[PDB]
Amino acid sequence: TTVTDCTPGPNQNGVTSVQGDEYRVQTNEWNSSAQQCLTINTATGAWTVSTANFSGGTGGAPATYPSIYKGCHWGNCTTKNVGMPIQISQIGSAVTSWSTTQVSSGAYDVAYDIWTNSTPTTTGQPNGTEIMIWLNSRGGVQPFGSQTATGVTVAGHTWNVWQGQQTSWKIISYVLTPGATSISNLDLKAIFADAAARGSLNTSDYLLDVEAGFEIWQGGQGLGSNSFSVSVTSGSAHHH
Ligand SMILES: [Cl-]
Ligand SMILES: [Cl-]
Ligand code: NA
Ligand code: NA
Ligand code: NA
Ligand code: NA
Ligand code: NA
Ligand SMILES: [Zn+2]
Ligand SMILES: [Zn+2]
Ligand SMILES: [Zn+2]
Ligand SMILES: [Zn+2]
């Protein structure tokens, strides 16, 4: 039940189904051909960056974003107990937990990447909002855009907020302050409400996916995911 995927970027994505295809793990080396290997437990969904040593500057785009997700990434979709796509305004609840393993070397973030879109499906780049949630970072890396709030309270935690404009979507990043290696029962509905209040999210958009992993600029070996869960609910109770 343990698989190792080194699919080289920048144009190939290696995608591994885990936990009955409730989640998928992707190499997603979207900006590099440097060696990157993931080791993935398909029963538990745990994974590790077992081989990586990225080099380059700490500015601009990262080399890679190896990640686990529920929902659709560029048309590659999970198939069990999904709850997405769903219009943000129609979400009943949305909760996630993530436990990570970090290394005190290199330059990276430890981040959720959450996509929204005007229509419920897309084959490519979402056109709504990218919501990032940085549990931690090191090595001097910073979020896209500009810091627009400092030490704000959202969904029971304290954050700095960064907002930016990409070519066809808006980005908002919640930077946990101080950083940590895990988060439990994070209320994404509360995050979405805040992002809408701050002008970064149209709540008529569809939520496409919830991803978590590491944007890596330098290093990367030994970063990992111990456990990951996403629950997005809708509809009413009904048994047959
Ligand atoms: Cl910007
Ligand atoms: Cl689950
Ligand atoms: Na499940
Ligand atoms: Na660079
Ligand atoms: Na980024
Ligand atoms: Na991004
Ligand atoms: Na809530
Ligand atoms: Zn990708
Ligand atoms: Zn906290
Ligand atoms: Zn905690
Ligand atoms: Zn905490």
Residue numbers in the entry: 2 to 241
Paper text:
GuxA is a multi-modular and multi-functional enzyme from Acidothermus cellulolyticus whose catalytic domains include a xylanase/endoglucanase GH12 and an exoglucanase GH6, representing a unique combination of these two glycoside hydrolase families in a single CAZyme. GuxA on the other hand contains an N-terminal GH6 domain linked to a CBM3 followed by a GH12 catalytic domain linked to a CBM2 on the C-terminal end. GuxA shows an optimal temperature range between 75 and 80 °C for all three substrates, which is well above the optimal growth temperature of 55 °C for A. cellulolyticus.
The structure of the GuxA GH12 domain was solved with and without cellobiose bound in the active site, to resolutions of 1.5 and 1.85 Å, respectively. The domain exhibits the classic GH12 β-jelly roll, with two curved β-sheets packed together-their concave face forming the active site-and one α-helix. The conserved N-terminal disulfide bridge is present (between Cys7 and Cys38-all residue numberings follow the sequence of the crystal structure), though the electron density indicates that this is partially reduced which might be an artefact of the X-ray diffraction experiment. A second disulfide bridge is also present, in two conformations, between residues Cys73 and Cys78. The active site cavity is lined with aromatic residues that accommodate the substrate without any significant change in structure at the local or whole-protein level—The Cα RMSD between the structures with and without cellobiose bound is 0.166 Å. Glu131 and Glu216 are the catalytic residues (the nucleophile and the general acid/base, respectively), whereas the strictly conserved active site aspartate residue is at position 114. In the case of the A. cellulolyticus GuxA GH12 domain, the leucine at this position probably makes a modest contribution to the enzyme’s thermal stability which, along with the extra disulfide bond, accounts for the thermotolerance of the enzyme. Comparison with the hyperthermotolerant GH12 enzymes suggests that the introduction of several additional salt bridges into the structure could raise the optimum temperature further, which could also be the case for its mesophilic and psychrophilic homologs. Analysis of the protein structure of the GH12 domain of GuxA provides some insight into its increased thermotolerance compared with other GH12 enzymes.
